[PDB]
Amino acid sequence: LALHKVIMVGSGGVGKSALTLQFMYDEFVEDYEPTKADSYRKKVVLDGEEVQIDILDTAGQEDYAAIRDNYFRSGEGFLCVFSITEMESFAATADFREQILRVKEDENVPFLLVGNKSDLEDKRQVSVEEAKNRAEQWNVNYVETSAKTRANVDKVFFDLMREIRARL
Numbered sequence: 001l002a003l004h005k006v007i008m009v010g011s012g013g014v015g016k017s018a019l020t021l022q023f024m025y026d027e028f029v030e031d032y033e034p035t036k037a038d039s040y041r042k043k044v045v046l047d048g049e050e051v052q053i054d055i056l057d058t059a060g061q062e063d064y065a066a067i068r069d070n071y072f073r074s075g076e077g078f079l080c081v082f083s084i085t086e087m088e089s090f091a092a093t094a095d096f097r098e099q100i101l102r103v104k105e106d107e108n109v110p111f112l113l114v115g116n117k118s119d120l121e122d123k124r125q126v127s128v129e130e131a132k133n134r135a136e137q138w139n140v141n142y143v144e145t146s147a148k149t150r151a152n153v154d155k156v157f158f159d160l161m162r163e164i165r166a167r168l
């Protein structure tokens, strides 16, 4: 089977683990240990082909840069997650982008910019327009998700797999 290696990145509390666990187990999990990194694997049928997805749910606790870089180097595609309710998490996405680019050396690395917590529109701090503009600058797609309602959760993982499939 094809094995699509996805890495979740983004600053704290944006929904990396909630997105992962919604995708994996169809549950909205709200208290998942913020410092716990873990990997997940499951079989999925991608455009009719049975494949395996491997998801590395990073937690930013590998502060030792060689280790963090090794984790990123193993990834084939990235979900770069921020929370639409925390502007500082959107600002932080630039750092994850640079980190990935330093390691993968490929500006076309499979990569989605993911604005999570789309069910909290009344708490939005990051405009759709400014996030789309950043994605356009990076030539990546922008998708807004809700790990709570499941909105676009399958989409971000499947579309990222489609980029891995096409590009590698």
Ligand SMILES: Nc1nc2c(ncn2[C@@H]2O[C@H](COP(=O)(O)OP(=O)(O)O)[C@@H](O)[C@H]2O)c(=O)[nH]1
Binding pocket: 010, 011, 012, 013, 014, 015, 016, 017, 018, 019, 029, 030, 031, 032, 034, 116, 117, 118, 119, 120, 145, 146, 147, 148, 149
């Ligand atoms: N309302 C809402 N809350 C969310 C969503 N995703 C995550 N959360 C909450 O935000 C907190 C942090 O989520 P988590 O996935 O642990 O963040 P991480 O640090 O990026 O792994 C948790 O308390 C979740 O319940 C979402 O899409 N909508």
Ligand SMILES: [Ca+2]
Binding pocket: 016, 017, 018, 032, 033, 034, 035, 036, 057, 058, 059
């Ligand atoms: Ca987490």
